[PDB]
Every structure is written in structure tokens, then in C-alpha cells.
């Protein structure tokens with residue numbers, strides 16, 4: 001929990017970059033990483049600190065709260081939250097093309113959301 005799974009560093013030292021960098025930790029299993037190690041964009045690096053982020057193994061739909069039907073569980077390209085295609089309104093029959101930003105991110109980030117330009 002107090003070490004980055006990817007570089008084995010900690011909050012005091014990112015071993016890849018040499019800089020101090022906060023860890024983000026999965027709210028369910030404790031899997032931790034530096035945001036840069038997790039290869040998050042600066043927008044996502046920021047977003048995962050504003051809510052109880054979950055790693056891919058633990059990720060649940062933010063709407064229904066389940067981790068079932070992973071073949072329909074979208075990840076927002078800005079905040080990394082999961083959403084089932086069928087939980088969205090309107091429901092999506094097929095996955096989207098290109099980048100996809102959830103409603104929370106569109107509201108908060110506006111023009112900085114991935115879906116734009």
C-alpha cells in the first residue's frame with residue numbers, strides 16, 4: 001500500500017522519474033501506483049484523487065455498483081470510472097468510437113474533456 005507496484009518507489013521517491021509523487025491506491029485491494037507510473041494523463045492524474053479510484057480488477061460501475069458484465073463496462077478516458085453501456089441513458093448498443101468522457105467529467109473539465117477536439 002505504501003509502495004508503487006510499478007517502480008517499487010513510494011510517495012517520497014518515484015524510482016522512474018526521481019521526483020516525489022503521491023501514490024494513488026485502489027480503494028478495495030490497495031494496489032498502489034504513482035499516477036505517472038499508471039500512465040495517467042495529467043487530467044486523469046488529478047481526477048483519480050477526487051474519488052475512491054478502483055484498479056481494473058476491482059472496478060465497479062458507478063451507476064449500479066456491480067463488477068459484472070466486464071464486456072460492457074466502459075472506462076471514462078478522463079477519470080477512469082467504470083459505467084455499463086446498459087446503465088447509461090440512453091443505453092448504448094455498441095461501444096463508442098474514439099475517446100469517451102463521462103457526464104461527471106464533461107461537467108467538471110468542460111473543454112479539457114477527452115471527447116472534445
Ligand SMILES: [Zn+2]
Nearest residue numbers: 004007034037
Ligand atoms: Zn512508481
Ligand SMILES: [Zn+2]
Nearest residue numbers: 026029055058
Ligand atoms: Zn483493486
Ligand SMILES: [Zn+2]
Nearest residue numbers: 061064084087
Ligand atoms: Zn452498471
Ligand SMILES: [Zn+2]
Nearest residue numbers: 076079102105
Ligand atoms: Zn469521467
